[PDB]
Write a protein that binds this ligand. Structure first.
Ligand SMILES: Nc1nc2c(ncn2[C@@H]2O[C@H](COP(=O)(O)OP(=O)(O)O)[C@@H](O)[C@H]2O)c(=O)[nH]1
Ligand SMILES: Nc1nc2c(ncn2[C@@H]2O[C@H](COP(=O)(O)OP(=O)(O)O)[C@@H](O)[C@H]2O)c(=O)[nH]1
Lengths: 683, 678
């Protein structure tokens, strides 16, 4: 394990995020080659092509250990950004930022993931570094700071102008795989435009630190280390995104890029510590820092089949150390696990290690009940990294497969997505064959339907998403009585029940309470729970619009029975009908899912954000300023949040991001309740 | 992937092994080799772990069963061994026979399950094939006959010597998943040791059949088919256990073992026919053969939740064939069921099938009142595959939430009919009834791992009962409460006697009223009142059983007498008559069966007698001793831990209800004192 670094400052866990056909595969291939041929030159103690096969590949660049993670490019990407400490964003110079990159960039923005940009395909016709860097501002609202400029356009691409050390690194002519660059003076053709972007970089660098601002403004020139260190601080704080260029296919620009990963991307020490919750006690927060002294905690993010080893579990260790053959707890499942062989996968070999320490990524063998997203931890000090509890779905969509083969494909999609997403719920009515999926939002459901149709090729009719409304009562209704007297064939059925129905808060979140005040055996004790079950069964339905009834307290006050005719079945009918009777007379109301929306926007677009939120019946809660940006917190009904992603992006020209969580159910306004009821009665 | 109708080409088997022995890695390799090799610089997932997985090896259908989780829960292990036709025993070459693998071996011995042995981890340092085969004889009393010999030791492990075909199958270098072997001649280093074990195998084969004994002794050499056929006969009869070796992690030896399952493990035709009983007629025996022509019979052995399909019931069909959308009867419950979609689960898909035929294992959909252990059968020829089990719980535990925040537990889940939930009303006081102390502990883990409740668990309490021993006559009670609005009146005179009943019934009500002295309108109310009072005790608050109430006389007021007043009268008169009929407390007596290693048997009988046990039999099965005894459940508390320490973890115990017996005098006073202490 001497090959695994314990100095986490010299470790970098990063991945490549890019649009498809942008060059992620070819860039990773070139990274792995250049890093191999430059490793232990004259220090090895003592044709070839690199393909990427492992989900995580470990390599070394200039005395730093680089753990590269294959980002799919969904819930899987959200997990990978937690496994990532930083990312390299690869763009196609012909197109700049593309619709796919927008989504991942905003998720990395949510989790404050430092990024550096590599504009690829600079050899191709139509590729432009300057146009592409514009699209980063226009569509991502990103402070993209070019740290280099291209030397040449289309076929004449030869290298890059280094804007930190003012020199040019050129690969002239047909460049061999792994061939180094020639360091030359900046060409005269580029001298002024280089000086313009040098000023832009120096101004950003000088404004970060007061000591350099006094130094820069005084006419003194900033040192390379001061410039380099300032860019790193800003990049790690997600303040700026350094931009590079090259041609991975033409073998131009890879080596400066690798330097940028070392120079400006964060180590396990630079990112904030891992925050999780105790196994139980979700509210209790547990924090695990990136040091071997802390208790062991690790997240499993990929399950794979190795051509030699069989089933392989990839894990990201955030804190502490564990050894091979030692027991750990799968905190997500509460089951014990024993770590088998431990590996760090290299480009062309499998490096076995004897223990799994903090800040590193490993492939584990002997795991039996660990799934992607599960947390492995010290048995004595247990942490769960992902939240285990989720509220019931608030939006539902209906899917009906077209053919009997689409039904079988839908059953293999609901199985693989269950493994990846525990947040979504599925139920199937075998009559009509209507699979209804519950989700956490319209976009969450929109993702699942797409993955069913593109990654699993289902052909089905998708319904329009329906908000999961509920019903409750606002008033106390007293001495509501119902009598069931059905004379079925032969012997009849009898049950009389008198209940008292009131709203019920639930101190700890309870939705229902049943109380029996029956005195003197007027209702036999054996029949009391049948009234409860009958009331609860009738609660499944609704008195107003057919939506479930919640926050009710049923008080069984009295009743009557015939010794022969009364049965558990009869007292369940009585409970059912009496609940429908009392709820109708107790001011029934409809409840709406309310969302806790938080929007981070620049000041200039903040007014346009609050105006949009007000139009969605939102209630503004806060107007904070965090990290030079303004954060608006508001409660918005989920019913009004349809299409927020596109509307926010249009109104704020792409510079604002948002997070939606469930908050509570609230009574629907009067004018909106009648619209809900009218639609439901017609459905 | 079609469904085979030639049941000779079918293998219903499972893997039994100690923990960390390689069950998961061997199952992984089986599923890969059977898929890619027969009917890579890669990485992928199918994320499927089915209770029963159907796969194919060389034109034979292999149905693999997941071995039960709770090894000490004897109801789960016996069910799976009934679903199994044969088993593959996986051992660690470094450790040989281990305590948990010993327990299942003796259980498989009880149920006559043919077994083959696979010595795994032969590439690990300290692994010895011959040491493991010695432990098979010393600790399992098993005629373990090696049909293979290891080629290499520890890191130099390369393959196996086949002792039937007398060749060597070697996997040289780093073996990829599914990589084939090279069949080579036995190395000279192993030629002598191979011939020694070849003679041992030939002698076992030759003594089986007289014809082969003539050929072997005559100097003629036995054919491969003759050796294979003899080993198969001996393996199916549990006379010999073939021994193999390999490395599941290093991908060496998997294909020979799959061959051994086909060659020497039993088919559905080779196992004895299914033996059951007619509903509610334990003495009447019904036999179902492994043929589609016989009436349909199937056992449900696993209930699971499918993400898309909902409830999934895994069934092992022993006899006949039934189609989708056809009705069957759940003989265990007496209710009818309609088979919905039928599935055979594969390593990477769900294969829909049109019928559930004999000798195969399926996943069923549309079942509502079928539980693990229930028997599905043709309505006309009703069979129950599992023996009758006591319904009422014998052990009770109290669970109280928190230390309302943890009322999340609804647990209306069918669970089993074995669990009964009743309320003593102390903070709700969910009291759960079970078949034993381990039974409840299994359920509590479900409530705490699958539902993560925070609760105080009580100490297990024996579910005692009460009864009467003498006849009491002319017991009268008069209910006269003059309430303001309306008064109430009811007089009843009853006769109370003990009543076992030819039908096994707990209660009998007879009315000998002569005139309309008690109106016919209120007779059923008196019966209900007596039954209500029987739920509670007269001595220590435990339910009363085996009572007969005879209503002899009474009185009524035309206005004041109601059904309620006579229910109070019937109730109070039973509490009064039972007190005067010599009430006694009854305790559940259990049929305990302990399978113990050779050495520790003596401590078992002494312990059982110290727990007020009555020894009934000792038998010798294989190399172990089986002690059967009748022991009161009250004295069996903590037996698992005491036996496991006493037998170094190598022994098995079974507890099933047997009968109720009167509690001894000094123990009756202890029970009563606690209850009166409330
Ligand atoms: N001319 C040119 N072609 C490139 C470059 N990078 C990638 N390509 C080509 O683009 C195609 C897709 O690139 P690929 O690595 O598969 O992108 P990915 O799908 O995002 O992983 C491949 O055929 C490459 O040959 C580049 O820098 N210049
Ligand atoms: N070296 C070696 N290790 C093995 C072999 N078979 C299993 N293992 C390892 O033993 C550990 C436990 O095996 P496992 O399949 O989980 O056994 P189980 O607990 O009974 O299911 C795992 O980490 C396996 O990788 C083998 O043939 N050789």
């Amino acid at each position: 394990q001497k090959d695994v670094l314990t100095d986490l400052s010299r470790v970098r866990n990063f991945g490549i995020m890019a649009h498809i056909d942008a060059g992620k595969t070819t860039t990773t291939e070139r990274i792995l080659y250049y890093t191999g041929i430059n490793y232990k030159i004259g220090e090895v103690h003592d044709e070839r092509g690199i393909t990427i096969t492992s989900a995580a590949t470990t390599t070394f660049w200039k005395d730093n250990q680089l753990n590269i993670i294959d980002t799919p490019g969904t819930v899987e990407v959200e997990r990978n950004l937690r496994v990532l400490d930083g990312a390299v964003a690869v763009f196609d110079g012909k197109e700049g930022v593309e619709p796919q990159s927008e989504q991942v960039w905003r998720q990395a923005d949510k989790y404050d993931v430092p990024r550096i940009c590599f504009v690829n395909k600079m050899d191709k016709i139509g590729a432009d570094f300057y146009f592409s860097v514009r699209t980063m501002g226009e569509r991502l609202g990103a402070n993209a700071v070019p740290i280099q400029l291209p030397v040449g356009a289309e076929a004449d691409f030869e290298g890059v102008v280094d804007l930190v050390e003012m020199n040019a690194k050129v690969w002239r002519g047909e460049t061999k795989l792994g061939e180094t660059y020639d360091t030359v003076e900046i060409p005269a053709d580029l001298a002024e435009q280089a000086e313009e972007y040098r000023t832009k970089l120096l101004e950003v660098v000088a404004e970060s630190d007061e000591h350099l601002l006094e130094k820069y403004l005084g006419g003194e020139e900033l040192t390379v280390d001061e410039i380099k260190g300032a860019i790193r601080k800003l990049t790690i704080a997600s303040e700026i995104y350094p931009v590079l260029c090259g041609s991975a296919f033409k073998n131009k620009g890879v080596q400066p890029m690798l330097d940028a990963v070392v120079d400006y991307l964060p180590s396990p020490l630079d990112v904030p510590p891992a925050i999780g919750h105790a196994p139980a006690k979700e509210d209790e927060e547990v924090v695990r820092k990136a040091t071997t002294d802390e208790p062991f905690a690790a997240l499993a993010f990929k399950i794979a089949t190795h051509p030699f080893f069989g089933k392989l579990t990839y894990i990201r260790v955030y804190s502490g150390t564990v050894e091979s053959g030692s027991q750990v707890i799968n905190a997500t499942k509460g089951k014990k696990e024993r770590l088998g062989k431990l590996f760090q996968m290299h480009s062309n070999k499998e490096n076995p290690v004897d223990r799994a320490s903090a800040g590193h990524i490993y492939a584990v063998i002997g795991l039996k009940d660990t799934t992607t997203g599960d947390t492995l931890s010290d048995p004595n000090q247990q942490i769960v990294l992902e939240s285990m509890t989720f509220p019931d779905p608030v939006i539902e969509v209906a899917i009906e497969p077209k053919t009997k083969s689409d039904q079988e494909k839908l059953s293999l999609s609901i199985q693989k997505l269950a493994e990846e997403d525990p947040t979504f719920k599925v139920h199937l009515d075998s009559e009509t064959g209507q699979t209804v999926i519950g989700g956490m939002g319209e976009l969450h459901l929109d993702i699942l339907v797409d993955r069913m149709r593109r990654e699993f090729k289902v052909e089905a009719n998708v319904g329009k998403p329906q908000v999961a409304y509920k019903e409750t009562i606002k008033r106390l209704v007293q001495n509501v009585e119902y009598t069931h007297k059905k004379q079925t064939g032969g012997s009849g059925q009898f049950a009389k029940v008198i209940i008292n129905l009131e709203p019920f808060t639930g101190e700890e979140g309870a939705t229902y309470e049943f109380e029996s005040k029956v005195t003197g055996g007027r209702i036999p004790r054996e029949y009391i729970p049948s009234v409860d079950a009958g009331a609860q069964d009738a609660m499944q339905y609704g008195v107003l619009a057919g939506y479930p009834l919640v926050n009710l307290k049923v008080t069984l006050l009295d009743g009557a029975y015939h010794e022969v005719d009364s049965s558990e079945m009869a007292f369940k009918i009585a409970g059912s009908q009496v609940l429908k009777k009392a709820a109708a007379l107790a001011q029934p109301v409809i409840l709406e899912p309310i969302m806790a929306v938080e929007v981070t926007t620049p000041e200039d677009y903040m007014g346009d954000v609050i105006g949009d939120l007000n139009s969605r019946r939102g209630q503004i809660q806060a107007m904070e300023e965090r990290a030079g940006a303004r954060v608006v917190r508001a409660h918005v009904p989920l019913s009004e949040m349809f299409g927020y992603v596109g509307d926010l992006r249009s109104k704020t020209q792409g510079r604002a991001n948002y997070s939606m969580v469930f908050d509570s159910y609230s009574e629907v306004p009067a004018n909106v309740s009648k619209e809900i009821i009218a639609k439901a009665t017609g459905e």
